[PDB]
Amino acid sequence: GTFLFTSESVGEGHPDKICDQISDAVLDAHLQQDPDAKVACETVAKTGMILLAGEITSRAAVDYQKVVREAVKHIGYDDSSKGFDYKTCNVLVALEQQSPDIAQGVHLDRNEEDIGAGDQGLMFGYATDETEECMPLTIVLAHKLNAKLAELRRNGTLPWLRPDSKTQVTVQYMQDRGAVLPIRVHTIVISVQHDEEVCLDEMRDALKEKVIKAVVPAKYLDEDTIYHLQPSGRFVIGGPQGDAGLTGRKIIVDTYGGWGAHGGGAFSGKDYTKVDRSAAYAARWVAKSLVKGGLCRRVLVQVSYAIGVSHPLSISIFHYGTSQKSERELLEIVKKNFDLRPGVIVRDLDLKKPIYQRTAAYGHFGRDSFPWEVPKKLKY
Amino acid sequence: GTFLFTSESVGEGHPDKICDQISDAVLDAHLQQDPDAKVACETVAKTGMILLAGEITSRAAVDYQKVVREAVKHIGYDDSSKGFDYKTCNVLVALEQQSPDIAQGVHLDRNEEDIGAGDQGLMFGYATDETEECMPLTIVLAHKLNAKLAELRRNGTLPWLRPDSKTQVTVQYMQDRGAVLPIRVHTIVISVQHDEEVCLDEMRDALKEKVIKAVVPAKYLDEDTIYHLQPSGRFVIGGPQGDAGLTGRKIIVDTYGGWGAHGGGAFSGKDYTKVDRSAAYAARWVAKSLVKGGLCRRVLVQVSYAIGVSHPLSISIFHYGTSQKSERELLEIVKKNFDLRPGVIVRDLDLKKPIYQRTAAYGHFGRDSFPWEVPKKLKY
Ligand SMILES: C[S@@+](CC[C@H](N)C(=O)[O-])C[C@H]1O[C@@H](n2cnc3c(N)ncnc32)[C@H](O)[C@@H]1O
Ligand SMILES: C[S@@+](CC[C@H](N)C(=O)[O-])C[C@H]1O[C@@H](n2cnc3c(N)ncnc32)[C@H](O)[C@@H]1O
Numbered sequence: 001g002t003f004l005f006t007s008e009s010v011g012e013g014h015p016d017k018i019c020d021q022i023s024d025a026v027l028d029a030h031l032q033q034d035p036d037a038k039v040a041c042e043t044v045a046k047t048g049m050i051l052l053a054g055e056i057t058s059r060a061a062v063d064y065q066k067v068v069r070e071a072v073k074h075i076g077y078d079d080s081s082k083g084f085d086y087k088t089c090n091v092l093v094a095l096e097q098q099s100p101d102i103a104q105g106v107h108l109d110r111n112e113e114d115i116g117a118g119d120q121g122l123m124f125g126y127a128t129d130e131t132e133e134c135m136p137l138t139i140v141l142a143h144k145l146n147a148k149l150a151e152l153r154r155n156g157t158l159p160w161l162r163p164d165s166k167t168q169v170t171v172q173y174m175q176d177r178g179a180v181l182p183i184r185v186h187t188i189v190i191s192v193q194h195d196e197e198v199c200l201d202e203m204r205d206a207l208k209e210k211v212i213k214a215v216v217p218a219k220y221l222d223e224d225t226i227y228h229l230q231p232s233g234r235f236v237i238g239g240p241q242g243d244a245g246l247t248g249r250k251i252i253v254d255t256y257g258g259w260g261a262h263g264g265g266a267f268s269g270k271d272y273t274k275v276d277r278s279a280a281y282a283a284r285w286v287a288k289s290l291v292k293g294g295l296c297r298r299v300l301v302q303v304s305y306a307i308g309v310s311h312p313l314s315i316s317i318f319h320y321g322t323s324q325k326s327e328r329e330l331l332e333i334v335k336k337n338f339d340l341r342p343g344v345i346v347r348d349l350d351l352k353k354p355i356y357q358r359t360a361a362y363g364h365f366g367r368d369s370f371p372w373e374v375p376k377k378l379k380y
Numbered sequence: 381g382t383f384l385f386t387s388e389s390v391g392e393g394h395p396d397k398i399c400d401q402i403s404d405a406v407l408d409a410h411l412q413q414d415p416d417a418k419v420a421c422e423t424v425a426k427t428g429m430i431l432l433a434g435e436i437t438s439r440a441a442v443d444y445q446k447v448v449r450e451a452v453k454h455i456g457y458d459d460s461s462k463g464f465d466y467k468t469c470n471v472l473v474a475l476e477q478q479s480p481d482i483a484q485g486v487h488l489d490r491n492e493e494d495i496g497a498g499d500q501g502l503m504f505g506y507a508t509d510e511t512e513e514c515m516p517l518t519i520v521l522a523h524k525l526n527a528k529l530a531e532l533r534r535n536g537t538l539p540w541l542r543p544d545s546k547t548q549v550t551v552q553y554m555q556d557r558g559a560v561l562p563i564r565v566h567t568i569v570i571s572v573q574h575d576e577e578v579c580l581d582e583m584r585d586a587l588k589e590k591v592i593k594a595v596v597p598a599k600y601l602d603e604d605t606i607y608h609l610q611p612s613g614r615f616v617i618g619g620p621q622g623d624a625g626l627t628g629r630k631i632i633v634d635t636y637g638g639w640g641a642h643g644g645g646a647f648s649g650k651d652y653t654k655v656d657r658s659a660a661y662a663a664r665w666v667a668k669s670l671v672k673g674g675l676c677r678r679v680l681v682q683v684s685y686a687i688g689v690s691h692p693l694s695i696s697i698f699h700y701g702t703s704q705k706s707e708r709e710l711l712e713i714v715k716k717n718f719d720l721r722p723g724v725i726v727r728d729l730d731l732k733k734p735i736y737q738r739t740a741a742y743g744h745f746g747r748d749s750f751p752w753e754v755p756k757k758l759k760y
């Protein structure tokens with residue numbers, strides 16, 4: 001009755017994640033001056049280059065050079081020896097206004113609560129009682145391994161570390177009436193960019209003793225656990241120099257690590273009218289509210305929209321057999337307790353607030369008591 | 381016992397899809413000259429611009445200007461009046477060699493069958509008996525609606541159409557012992573870029589009569605079906621001018637439309653050593669082989685890899701309760717019948733062949749009898 005499941009995460013200096021963080025730094029900079037900014041900011045990263053491309057209509061006056069370079073500085077790319085330097089990279093901007101055709105169909109001359117969805121699309125929310133924060137253990141552990149690397153880099157105890165990292169965790173689970181119960185960690189992968197002087201053995205020993213053991217409870221690690229630590233053997237070239245980055249290329253890291261489902265939309269760089277983000281956050285909030293409210297142990301919520309239409313076109317609930325109530329009954333509870341129009345989600349989840357850069361590494365869910373992580377008390 | 385499920389698709393001129401097609405045109409151009417080319421080609425599109433960014437190590441001599449412009453011509457963006465013109469757009473190139481650190485850890489001095497995975501990651505394959513091609517009806521219909529638009533554009537019967545389109549289909553399903561049975565179409569969305577002269581009523585009438593009715597069987601359409609046709613009211617600005625495009629931003633359209641699961645990796649622009657593509661294709665092949673072999677009605681397969689390691693780190697099977705055999709037994713059948721090392725997948729699925737641009741619109745799965753769509757006869 002057991003099975004394996006694998007999830008991955010990446011660090012703050014992973015090139016795709018750099019782009020997500022820059023896109024959300026730009027969004028936050030606009031929102032600080034104009035809470036109603038319309039933002040659709042993609043970031044592209046390659047050796048020596050950050051390019052911003054997309055559509056922004058905003059009353060803000062934003063210094064893109066400063067916003068980009070400060071985000072890169074925070075990540076830790078501050079010297080040519082590391083492969084990338086915020087002080088001296090190229091920042092290119094190809095930003096236009098939002099299409100007037102979109103604007104007129106979505107939000108122009110519309111009451112805020114009745115704004116249309118900014119696009120069509122589908123979105124999912126997921127929650128699992130296997131951890132207190134209602135997230136899959138595989139992805140929680142993967143994120144925490146990347147966060148530990150950044151901590152040990154920033155505090156100087158492993159000064160050979162660089163910002164670009166990836167981790168991957170495979171857990172053996174037991175089925176339990178539709179819920180899932182973690183048993184043990186089967187395999188861990190860690191790859192992290194490093195300086196030219198440190199040797200493989202020093203790195204592998206540190207990754208096991210100072211990273212894995214500082215993150216993963218010993219009860220999950222045993223004589224059979226497989227470790228792939230610096231499996232490529234050499235990772236000196238990294239960041240955008242090693243691999244181009246783009247916004248919205250870590251959408252599974254951003255969400256549930258392969259569990260649940262995904263509708264395809266990226267989060268970073270987008271204001272609340274883009275339901276790819278706001279409705280996914282709302283669907284997480286619904287799912288977590290159902291689990292924390294004791295109605296389910298595990299649940300998947302789908303919603304979908306049409307551009308220009310406020311109310312979702314469809315709402316669906318799948319409880320994996322982990323509720324006494326039928327999925328039909330849960331759907332009625334959701335419809336009674338939640339209003340998933342984007343112009344209402346924005347009020348419930350406070351989505352004009354410039355907190356987005358904080359969401360753009362280590363997953364958008366399961367951390368920090370963001371509004372979508374605070375369950376709603378359900379009436380039924 | 382019924383539920384709704386929604387999937388979307390996009391057309392050939394959708395800006396993200398333009399990028400996927402260009403990335404795969406570049407891959408094919410390299411493979412035509414060098415079957416062992418190492419390609420990681422991202423494309424970015426905005427008003428007037430195609431940018432190629434990434435890493436290519438290849439013996440080919442490729443004229444990027446010609447390859448990009450011919451791909452855009454094929455899509456149909458051939459005039460400033462349409463918002464984009466292959467003849468006169470900017471093509472910018474920021475392509476470097478593959479990182480030598482990656483190369484040495486993945487493929488340098490390695491027997492081809494024993495090449496390492498080109499990255500870590502997780503990948504899923506899915507199949508459902510609800511259609512002959514073993515794909516979800518929601519996404520099949522969504523793709524076919526986009527293909528119908530392109531057909532009517534290219535044959536001149538709706539000459540106001542432009543290449544950028546999106547569609548979305550919501551189907552009401554019945555559960556059936558873990559399998560799913562489509563009942564009816566609940567809602568259809570179509571948005572398509574159009575010329576300045578055609579009016580909304582002419583467009584909505586054509587979309588219903590000449591597009592939907594030519595694609596969706598009447599048995600699925602009834603008095604309750606909801607139609608959102610040109611719901612934004614105006615879509616003259618389109619293509620990259622309306623919305624930036626990037627490679628790998630339609631990964632759910634490329635796969636299963638929200639059904640099954642996704643590991644996060646993009647397909648387009650990548651040679652066979654990038655398991656994001658090859659192992660997802662192999663996992664589809666496994667899933668479809670299990671369904672066509674009569675072992676399951678519906679199945680999800682996960683695999684995962686570490687950079688530099690040939691064999692998958694994990695393999696998992698979930699049959700939704702649609703097999704008499706346990707998931708454990710199915711996993712043993714898979715392990716006996718398939719070798720999911722990338723250096724073996726390449727031989728089984730013929731992944732050096734330059735057929736990739738054909739995969740880059742209308743989904744990678746369920747069409748055209750590609751090798752991953754031809755089931756393997758299973759021995760057990
Ligand atoms: C392996 S690269 C993707 C393939 C790459 N584009 C190529 O040209 O082969 C994906 C990610 O792996 C990590 N990476 C880069 N160089 C690496 C190395 N030498 N060893 C291990 N991981 C590496 C970085 O996080 C990078 O963003
Ligand atoms: C709605 S746009 C995403 C939001 C956009 N970036 C913005 O600035 O608001 C996403 C896709 O919708 C389609 N689209 C563009 N303009 C549209 C319009 N006026 N009406 C409907 N769909 C449109 C195109 O396929 C485009 O790639």
Ligand SMILES: Cc1cc(=O)n2nc(-c3ccccc3)c(-c3ccccc3)c2[nH]1
Pocket residue numbers: 003004005175178179258259260261320640641680681682696697698707
């Ligand atoms: C026995 C059993 C009970 C169960 O409820 N589930 N759910 C999922 C699942 C579904 C979608 C996304 C991620 C996980 C799976 C599964 C396990 C291994 C590989 C693939 C899927 C599963 N396997």
Ligand SMILES: Cc1cc(=O)n2nc(-c3ccccc3)c(-c3ccccc3)c2[nH]1
Pocket residue numbers: 260261300301302316317318327383384385555558559638639640641700
């Ligand atoms: C009753 C029933 C039986 C069943 O086997 N499934 N599977 C899925 C599913 C799981 C992952 C991805 C896509 C679909 C769902 C479902 C339905 C509506 C919304 C969300 C999920 C479902 N609902």
Ligand SMILES: [Cl-]
Pocket residue numbers: 016499
């Ligand atoms: Cl990556």
Ligand SMILES: [Cl-]
Pocket residue numbers: 119396
């Ligand atoms: Cl889109």
